[PDB]
Amino acid sequence: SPIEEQATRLLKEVPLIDGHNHFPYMIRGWFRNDINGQDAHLYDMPIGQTDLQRLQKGLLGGQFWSAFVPCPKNPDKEVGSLEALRQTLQQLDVIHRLIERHPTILQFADSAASIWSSFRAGRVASLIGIEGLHQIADSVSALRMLHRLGVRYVTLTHNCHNAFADAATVSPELHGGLSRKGERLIRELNRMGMMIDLSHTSHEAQTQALRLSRAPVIYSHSSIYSLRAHARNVTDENLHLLHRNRGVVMICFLRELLASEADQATLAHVIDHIIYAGTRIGYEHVGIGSDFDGMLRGPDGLHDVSCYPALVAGLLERGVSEEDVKRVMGLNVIRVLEEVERVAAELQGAGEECLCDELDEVWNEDIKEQLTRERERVRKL
């Protein structure tokens, strides 16, 4: 088929970069992160929408792999938040090991340049996102260390409220958008070069973040509110503010975000959502954010990671230009990451002060006086 040949050509010319996929959590669920001697299963998985053979088959160019851990269920909230941090390091560890053990398929990327080098080498550019500020145990130091471990976006919330911002699905609303700490965290995220992800956050929190951020943001996996009313989809107001922000909405394959009856959700509906956003805020602000493995069953025609060529072909069939399809596939999210990094370099070059954690005093006045007296003794020598 000529349109299928066109789609295959595009997938080899530009990387299709998907915004969100939970294969790392499936590995935690199925293998408990022990992948030693499990290559046969990692290539042909007995569960889920992602494995290494189907990943190749769908011609995906890059992937933000989610280092998701669930909300803390512990009644002692200090313990649950700290437990979430340990589990986050477990998920980052298995992502890095998955990449390192399959270097002919996966190559770690943390920048626009590293995405392209991976794609030139025929590798799936493998980036990392965390899904909620519950994962950092209320530590901006931990967050910066997660950045050093390769995390390049932070979803401000999952379906858990936190000290910084409001999730969408939970009511009553805690902060009513962003907290004062949330506002201050946006400055730090921009300064360090961490991409802000507004998926799973409340409509008001999105509006505030879109007005405050000095760098373009993403929705790693959400769809269009005007086509399907859901707390997780992006309103017309926030689509406009996303345009002004220069950000990208990465359209989600979750059936419940595409249709009122989930079993009616299709590939056509995903294309409807992409075209709606593209028409109204331009095709330079729309992406693809499957959320594969964040669901049991995908839409008709988008059942797993092998189905991306059908999406590319579907967009071309509906009249979306070759150049605009390339933008939706991955050039837009590359641009956002590039601009996020440029903003960070500009702020770090200007010597902007970093956000520090509030720490306990470890020394009393007696220890400090002993130390200052000792220093003066040394000065006299």
The residue ranges that bind Fe ion (CB under 5 A) are: 294
Nearest approach in angstroms of CB 155 to Fe ion is 7
> How many beta carbons lie within 10 A of that of residue 291, not counting itself?
25
In the complex with a copy of itself, the residue whose CB is nearer, 6 or 90, is: 90
Number of Cβ within a 10 Å radius of residue 116? 17
Query: Quick one: which of 296, 319, 349, 366 contacts a copy of itself (CB under 8 A)?
Result: 296
Q: Is 40 in the site for a copy of itself (CB under 8 A)?
A: no
Dihedral pair phi/psi, residue 244, rounded to 5°: -60, -40
Question: Minimum distance between the CB of residue 254 and a copy of itself, rounded to whole angstroms?
Answer: 15
Contact between 79 and a copy of itself by CB under 8 A: the answer reads yes
The yes or no reply on residue 214 touching a copy of itself (CB under 8 A) is no
Calculate the dihedral angle through the C-alpha atoms of 231, 95, 181, 337, rounding to the nearest 10 degrees: -80
**CB 140 to a copy of itself: min, Å:** 8
- Measure Cα distances from 224 to 128, 142, 158, 221, 234 in Å: 24, 33, 18, 11, 5
Per-residue interface string for the shown chain with a copy of itself, residues 336-375, x marking contact by CB under 8 A: -----------------xx-xxxx-xxx---xx-xxx-xx
- Rounded Cα gap, residues 16 and 239, in angstroms: 22
The least CB distance from residue 49 to a copy of itself, in Å, is 8
297's contact among Fe ion, a copy of itself, none, with CB below 5 to 8 A by partner kind, is a copy of itself
Q: Going along 94-247, which residue ranges are E strands?
A: 106-108, 124-131, 151-155, 195-197, 218-219
40 interface partner picked from a copy of itself, Fe ion, none, CB below 5 to 8 A per type: none
Distance CA 250, CA 309 (A): 17
Q: Is the dihedral of CA 344, 209, 136, 126 positive or negative?
A: negative
Tokens for 254?
Answer: 């979750």
We find the least distance from the C-beta atom of residue 127 to a copy of itself, in angstroms, to be: 15
Q: Tell me: does residue 29 bind a copy of itself (CB under 8 A).
A: yes
Total length of the chain = 381
> Nearer to a copy of itself by C-beta: 194 or 209?
194
Place of tokens 């951020």: 213
Give the residue with the Cβ less far from a copy of itself, 16 or 85.
85
Q: How far is CA 275 from CA 172, 278, 294, 377, 378, in A?
A: 34, 5, 24, 74, 72
**Residue 279 near which of Fe ion, a copy of itself, none (CB within 5-8 Å, type-dependent):** none
DSSP letters along 10-36, please? HHHHS--EEEEE-HHHHHHHHHTT--T
Nearer to a copy of itself, 89 or 231 (CB): 89
How many C-alpha atoms does 97 have within 13 Å on its Cβ side? 18
Footprint (CB under 8 A) of a copy of itself, residues 93-132: 93-94, 96-97
> Percent helix, strand and coil across the chain, each rounded to 5?
50, 10, 35
Tokens of 104: 């002919």
Site map for a copy of itself, 299-328, x if CB under 8 A?
A: ----xx------------------------
Tell me: does residue 5 bind a copy of itself (CB under 8 A).
no
Measured from each CB, the residue nearest to Fe ion is 294
Q: How many CB atoms lie within 10 A of CB 276?
A: 18
Nearer to a copy of itself, 41 or 214 (CB): 41
Q: How far is CA 247 from the centre of its chain?
A: 13
**Residue from 145, 176, 321, 322 that binds a copy of itself (CB under 8 A)?**
145
Q: Is 231 in the site for a copy of itself (CB under 8 A)?
A: no
CB neighbourhood size of 47 (10 A): 12
Given candidates 32, 77, 244, 342, which one binds a copy of itself under the rule CB under 8 A?
A: 32
The residues that touch a copy of itself, with contacts defined as CB under 8 A, are 28-30, 32-34, 36-37, 45-49, 76, 78-79, 82-83, 85-86, 89-90, 92-94, 96-97, 137, 139, 141-142, 144-145, 148-149, 296-297, 303-304, 353-354, 356-359, 361-363, 367-368, 370-372, 374-375, 378, 381
